[PDB]
Amino acid sequence: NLXQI
Amino acid sequence: PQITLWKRPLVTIKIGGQLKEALLDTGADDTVIEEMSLPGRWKPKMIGGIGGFIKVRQYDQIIIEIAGHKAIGTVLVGPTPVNIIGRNLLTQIGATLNF
Amino acid sequence: PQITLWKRPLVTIKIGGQLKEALLDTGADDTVIEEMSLPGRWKPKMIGGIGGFIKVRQYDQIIIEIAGHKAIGTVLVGPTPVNIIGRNLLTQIGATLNF
Ligand SMILES: [Cl-]
Ligand SMILES: [Cl-]
Ligand SMILES: [Cl-]
Ligand code: NA
C-alpha cells in the first residue's frame, strides 16, 4: 500500500 | 515517542468517541478517514493519490486524539484503503521526521 | 536532519545516475519512482492507494542516494504522480517519526 495531495 | 519504520506506523486515534487505527503519513497533506458520521456541515474536496483522484467530504474543526495527543482540525471522509493522519494534524502534535 | 512537516518533505535523490526530487512517505510500504530505465531484471506488480491501483515494474537490489545517504532495496517504477521514498528505504537511512 502506497499512501495524498 | 520515537517510531521506527520497519512496520507500518499505526497508532490509535479517537474521534466521535470511537477508537480507530490510523497510519501516520508524512506523504499525505491531509487526514483521511473511512466512512463515519461527523457533526456539522461538510464541503467538497478532491484528493489525489497513487491511483488517481477521489471525492471526499471535508469537515472542519473536528476534535481528534492521536496517540494520546489532542488535535482539532480538518478531517476528510471517503473511500481510503486505510485511515491516514496527514501533515495537517501531524504538525499539531509536533511530529518531525529525523534521520 | 530533522524535517518539520509544515511543508511536503521533499528531498533530492540520486538513482540510475539521475537526480530527482522525491517525497519521504511514511505511509508508503514501497518506493515508487516515475518512469525511467533501471538495469537488470524486473517483474510486474500492482500497487494501490487512494484512487485505486497502478501497474509498475519491480526492480530489486537497486542503490539510491537519499539526501546524501546511500541505501539499497527494491524500487518500483511506473506512472506515479510523485516520486515516493517508502519505508523499505527509509528504514535503511535510519528515519524515525518523533513527537
Ligand atoms: Cl487542519
Ligand atoms: Cl526492499
Ligand atoms: Cl533501527
Ligand atoms: Na536487480
> Which CATH number goes with the domain that contains B46?
2.40.70.10
Cα of B90 from ligand 1 centre, angstroms: 10
Distance in Å, alpha carbon of A4 to nearest chain C alpha carbon? 7
B8 within 8 A of B23, measured Cβ to Cβ:
yes
Cα of B96 from ligand 3 centre, angstroms: 16
What's the order of all strands across the beta sheet hosting B2-3?
B2-3, C96-98, B96-98, C2-3
Instruction: Look at C48 and A2 and tell me if their CB atoms are within 8 Å.
Output: yes
Number of compact structural domains in chain C? 1
Grid cell 533530492 in the structure block, residue? C12
Q: How was this structure determined?
A: X-ray
Task: For residue C7, count other CB atoms closer than 10 A to its CB.
Answer: 10
Neighbouring-strand partners of residue C76: C32, C58
Within 60-99 of C, beta carbons closer than 8 Å to A belong to 80-82, 84, 86
B27: left (phi over 0), alpha (psi -120 to 50) or beta: alpha
* Chain A touched by C50 (CB under 8 Å): yes
Tell me, in Å, the resolution of the deposited structure. 1.5
Instruction: Look at A2 and B50 and tell me if their CB atoms are within 8 Å.
Output: yes
Report the candidate in C82, C99, C89 with the shortest Cα–Cα distance to residue C26: C89
Q: How far apart are CA C34 and CA B83, in angstroms?
A: 25
C60 is catalytic: no
β strands within chain C, DSSP E:
2-3, 10-15, 18-24, 32-33, 42-49, 52-66, 69-77, 84-85, 96-98
Q: How far apart are CA C67 and CA A2, in angstroms?
A: 21
Cα of C89 from ligand 2 centre, angstroms: 7
Enter the C-alpha cell of residue B22.
Answer: 490510523
Ion ligand 1: residues, CB within 5 A, are B 73-74, 88
Domain span including residue B53: 1-99
